[PDB]
Amino acid sequence: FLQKEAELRLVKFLPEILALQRDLVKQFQNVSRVEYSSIRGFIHSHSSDGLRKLLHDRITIFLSTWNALRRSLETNGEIKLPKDYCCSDLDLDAEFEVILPRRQGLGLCGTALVSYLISLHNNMVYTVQKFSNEDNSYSVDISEVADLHVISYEVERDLNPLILSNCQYQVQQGGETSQEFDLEKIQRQISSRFLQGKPRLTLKGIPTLVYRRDWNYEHLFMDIKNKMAQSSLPNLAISTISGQLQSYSDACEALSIIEITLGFLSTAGGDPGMDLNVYIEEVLRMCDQTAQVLKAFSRCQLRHIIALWQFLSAHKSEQRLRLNKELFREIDVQYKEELSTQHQRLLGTFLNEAGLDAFLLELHEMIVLKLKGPRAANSFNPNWSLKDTLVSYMETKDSDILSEVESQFPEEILMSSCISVWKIAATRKWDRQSRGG
Amino acid sequence: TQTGHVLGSPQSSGVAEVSDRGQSPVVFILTRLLTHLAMLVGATHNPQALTVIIKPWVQDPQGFLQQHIQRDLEQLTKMLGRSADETIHVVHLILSSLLRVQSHGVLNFNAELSTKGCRNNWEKHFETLLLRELKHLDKN
Amino acid sequence: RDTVTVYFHAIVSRHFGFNPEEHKVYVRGGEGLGQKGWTDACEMYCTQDLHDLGSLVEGKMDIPRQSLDKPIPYKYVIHVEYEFIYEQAQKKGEHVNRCLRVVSTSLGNGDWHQYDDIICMRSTLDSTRKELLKGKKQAAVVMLDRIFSVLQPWSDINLQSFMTQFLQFYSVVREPMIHDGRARKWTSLQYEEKEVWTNLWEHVKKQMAPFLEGKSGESLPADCPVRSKLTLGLSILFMVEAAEFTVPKKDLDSLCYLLIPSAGSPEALHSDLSPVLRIRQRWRIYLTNLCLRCIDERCDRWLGILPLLHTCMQKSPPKKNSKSQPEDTWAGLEGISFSEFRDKAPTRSQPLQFMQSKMALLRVDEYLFRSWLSVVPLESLSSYLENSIDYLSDVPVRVLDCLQGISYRLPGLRKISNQNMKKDVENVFKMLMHLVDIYQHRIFGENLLQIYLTECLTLHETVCNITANHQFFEIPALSAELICKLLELSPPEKSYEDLVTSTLQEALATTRNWLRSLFKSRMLSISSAYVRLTYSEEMAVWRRLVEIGFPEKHGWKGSLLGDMEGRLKQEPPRLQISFFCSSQCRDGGLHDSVSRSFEKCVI
Amino acid sequence: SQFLDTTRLVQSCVQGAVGMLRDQNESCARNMRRVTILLDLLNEDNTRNASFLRESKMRLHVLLNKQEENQVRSLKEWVTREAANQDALQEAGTFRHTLWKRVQDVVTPILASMIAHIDRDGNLELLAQPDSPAWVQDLWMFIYSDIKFLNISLVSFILVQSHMNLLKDAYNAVPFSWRIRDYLEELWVQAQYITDTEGLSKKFVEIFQKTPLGVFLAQFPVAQQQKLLQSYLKDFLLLTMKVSSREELMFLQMALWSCLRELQEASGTPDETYKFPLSLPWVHLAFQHFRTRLQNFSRILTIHPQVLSSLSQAAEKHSLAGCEMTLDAFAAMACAEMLKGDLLKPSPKAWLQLVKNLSTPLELVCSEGYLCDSGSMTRSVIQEVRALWNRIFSIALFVEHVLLGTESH
């Protein structure tokens, strides 16, 4: 307690800064929609004088406690932050973004402060529990914390008298004045008022705003695979589908419909049965567009949806190949490099003995999910091979044919030219499919 | 990590500079005071080398370390239930007691403080000597 | 806590022969005062000598809170001579005595102020009533003077004490009350609140007069209780508002003169005066109802009340037009219908002269210029822009607010049919280009070029759709000249190139849409064997829209020429040959591109 | 106008709008429910549905009007701009199909944001729930029929957030919970800033009746007004404090109602602010005057889950909460009785942990600072629970001093 009393004295204002964070989160529930340069303009941008003074005193206290605690955050908090935050004494005329509890850029001030406060409170209560109580179940979230639940005291008004009453004077017959601090009475006095009966705080109800736009589609695939026992598409089924979507605008409409239905299914439930027809028509109730796509989806259930999506995506891209149409128009040009004669020769050597149908599909999925253009060399720099990244991406969730792409795939695929391999494979498949009959 | 002398301006209302991961508060305080006065002694010859050593400031080691020492001394006089003269007496006793510690048991540590292990060993021996000499001031 | 402080103020008449040195005064009343009934409850101390009127006397006491909203009988005694009320008792043997009713809701700061009129000694009806009425009038005047003096020094606490004291003063005076068995109004006085506030206004006018003559500070009369003109204006505002009583229209020229921020040009004085007026809610309604009451056919000095209202909100919004809200919020008014005054017969030539007399007021804030932009008549707006050359030279940024204002007012104005506002528009646009190119290119500095480009293109789009007569093409012509000259002035990353490409594309698209829009017909129809254009002055129109110098990497020489060649090709070759040298396609413009295109089409 | 079937457009694009909506991964994801309820309420058969469609039409109109003003008109002239986008043309079949696709993709994010801003906790379910009292739909329409009061912003997977940690199908009884909460909070802030803490109730209620919402609710009859009031206490209690039960929610409901009545009994006989005592602001007033007490009551409800059993008999054997509040006092009484009942049954150490966990709340409730003023019966109750609390605390000290020593040593 005397080790961390200095910072324990400032946990009384944690509800205030937390309420400020809730208000700022609710009032700015967006991304990249901020225009206020300084906090002064933001606070003066309110006609309500009472609300203005509320924000004034709240932000003054927030600034004071942040300045008082901006030393242990770089060394003791469980979140790592750069030193540029605590190097300067922030003022009222400082930048505005700092008061926003983000988690990645310049927003770690409030998050780090509240996390340090809750961490020290939790550590203190945990130590107290493991000292004497040895058991507890009382705990509350940060969504309804009050001034009654936090630990608050004033040294001059409450802490000094309680300890000064526990200074014992002893005198001997010979004449002396010895000072003794009986540990038991002071321990019971301090414990029974401040650090007993307090809840065990958890980090669940933290005021935090969403910074990442959840559009990587990978969490949707994981949610689909975890919620349902997804199954692969039967060969006759996929053959019929490819038969009934030979057009292009048909493929685009199918893409739109399946993307909407996948967006619904990833953030909700779905029975592995209950074929895609009845799911389309009456589960979410959209109107009929074209009988062709419905007749295509008729022979599929929910347990194939993602697989269907991937195949459908490939089909669209594959169509763009036949009509000599620029097939991506979105990806980086650094990957749009032509393979060399030896490269395509080894690629054809692989293609001569390969299950092209699944391989082209998965490789197209890899490009369309990760090779989006900018910000793509972080883990897929155009200097690796394909067998390593393919096996790494497929060992996660795939148990399909693997040995062909690690015992027969080219060892120098030149990832820099990654579209060329799939394009040449698709041309080979199209020639095989069309020129025979 | 974060080597050097990274510290804010002493005129700050922040934390009281509580002890680090593994040191008693009194020993840690005495050790940091001795390190600060050692940096003053070194800077009194070549302030440019210290300017390179300490990261934030570029103007004057002397004034900033003087404010540091003033804060240190006032927190020491707030530390011992003595008089400021008696705090000075205690620090003088501590300083003069480590001169008569000719007993050599300070092996297996580097004399340059270039590694964290040797730095921690130096801190360990410094803690040992500081406690040995602070358990001898009440009766002196 | 259980006691309320009541401050009794009275006047002892000269007929009493009262001497503060020798005679003492007390307030004796029933048990409602908190002391024993009809006993000396509050000692009543003299403060000022009123000469012929008598002696002004003040005192205080503490009454129980249980007495709130209840009638308490009381009278003034002089040490013993009881005060005499010239009223006949309803019940024989009962004493007509003053009634104290402390209003719980009107306590305000917690202290009540009971104002009692001149204390009259019994003279050992109509003439006596008139004399008593005169004495009460003078008493009300002097206590209003005291409430005036309470306002000094200019502080928030003094202002609150002032408003509470004035409320209690009005409540006491407007309804003279007496207590003889039961509290009742003093109807025999016939002192209706009408005459009460007639006397109050006549007293107020003598405080109004000195400031109208230019007196301020030391030059003011030494008996003037209010020293700052703005303070006196706020005081009369508070008094007339709390009573909601009519003001003579002659007195507006005075009361609106008081509120002018004389000797308050720096914003430091207004920021330091803000704490005296911290409440930002009641003052808004007060000032809005003041201006709306002054919106009558005088509307002269009210322009001075805008800065006072405009000194106590947020800072100037730098946002582009059409994004936030219409002119009400941008100018900061939100409560004045300037649309009816900007669009009407401009019989009031005063505002222009007022503005010319108050250049200094334009520096006291930043909302004043934008507010004046949306209120000035359009025909005089060129002179308004001319008068602000110094203001724009001090800060070469207010031209952004000028663009915001014009792009605000222009779409509201109806379609064009006249010649007067033609002169208005050309004059205001020429003053605009003048004030644009004279100063510098620092207007585009600090990365401010993007919003300026957006404002210009929005002005282009919003001014294209008000011209459909092929003779006002000069408005889009100088609009294109304006965008051209603001394109070439900014200093030379690729962001500027992208912005200039997009802006010039939007400009030429808007011009093209306009040219297609007003030309919804054929052209060069013959109908007489003497072929002439259905838009006779169209060719010169083209002539002014092509010479404007734009970067040749862009279009305007491959796009617009294609537009003309598409326009001409529908006409039969014989007809265009006949029109070709019909003495109307004259003016070979020294390798004029349009004449050369005419040549190419004809060959 | 007739230039495009707006109703058809929204009926087609609701699926796209709600498909990208997501809750906090566990807060009753209702995507299929959301689209089903929307299509239930997106027809023209009912006049209520027609009014909803009209209001949605005007809201979409004004939102898009404010939206396109940042465009450079290169997208305002959307037809030609789309046509020049030839890949968009070849992906969308014919030309009219492509125009419809562009319109629906323009409309879908805006409507999704509208659903997110409106369906914060389930406001839509009230309209679809049958036998809904007239005040429900009247207030929902009234709040949905304003601009300044309910201002809607815009912005990928947008987020809709819960405000009360809703249980299974909470469907907040009030048409709008958070908006009314914040509106009344800021009204209280302004009223308390402008005027001192002497006519705080009067100024707050008068500025409540000054707003259009107050004059709207004044037209509601007494029965609907009081049902709306009770639902308002319920939603405010659920929002402010989260309870893991149902009976304790009703206990808090009655406690807050008793506190409100007691506050409405503080003044002797004003007859100017008590002429509309069945009004919304009193709720906030009650909290602002009794929050600590309520908080402590919350604690004594959260610290012991079995005490509710005794509360289960309270109104049955006390008929309490008539004029003033006494539920915290009865909770203290029940806790003291359960202390004095057994004293050894679960375990002496488990007992010691129980009594020490509830030691400090029982100390707080038995404080003169806690009970500033109340009825004399309540004062007698606090004195007797003080006596019983001191007795049980002495027993706890005794056991912790002797039994621990004689069982460990």
Numbering used by the authors:
A (entry chain A): 4714 to 5150
B (entry chain A): 4499 to 4638
C (entry chain A): 345 to 423, 432 to 476, 487 to 854, 863 to 973
D (entry chain A): 3472 to 3626, 3637 to 3890
Task: Copy the relevant paper text.
The giant E3 ubiquitin ligase RNF213 is a conserved component of mammalian cell-autonomous immunity, limiting the replication of bacteria, viruses and parasites.
To investigate whether ATPase activity is coupled to E3 activity, we disrupted adenosine-5’-triphosphate (ATP) binding or hydrolysis at the two functional ATPase subunits AAA3 and AAA4 of murine RNF21328. Together, these data indicate that ATP binding rather than hydrolysis is required to activate the RNF213 E3, regardless of whether the substrate is proteinaceous or non-proteinaceous. Consistent with this, the WB4 mutant underwent robust ABP labeling at ~100-fold reduced ATP levels indicative of sustained RNF213 activation and confirming that ATP hydrolysis counteracts ATP-dependent activation. To enforce an ATP bound state, reasoning this might capture the activated conformation, we determined a structure of the RNF213 WB34 double mutant in the presence of ATP. Although ATP could be modeled into AAA4, AAA3 was empty and once again, there was no clear RZ/Ub density and no clear basis for elevated transthiolating activity. Although we do not elucidate the structural detail of the active site itself, our structure suggests ATP binding induces either long-range allosteric repositioning of the RZ domain, or conformational fine-tuning of the E2-docking CTD, to enable transthiolation from the bound E2~Ub conjugate to the E3 active site.
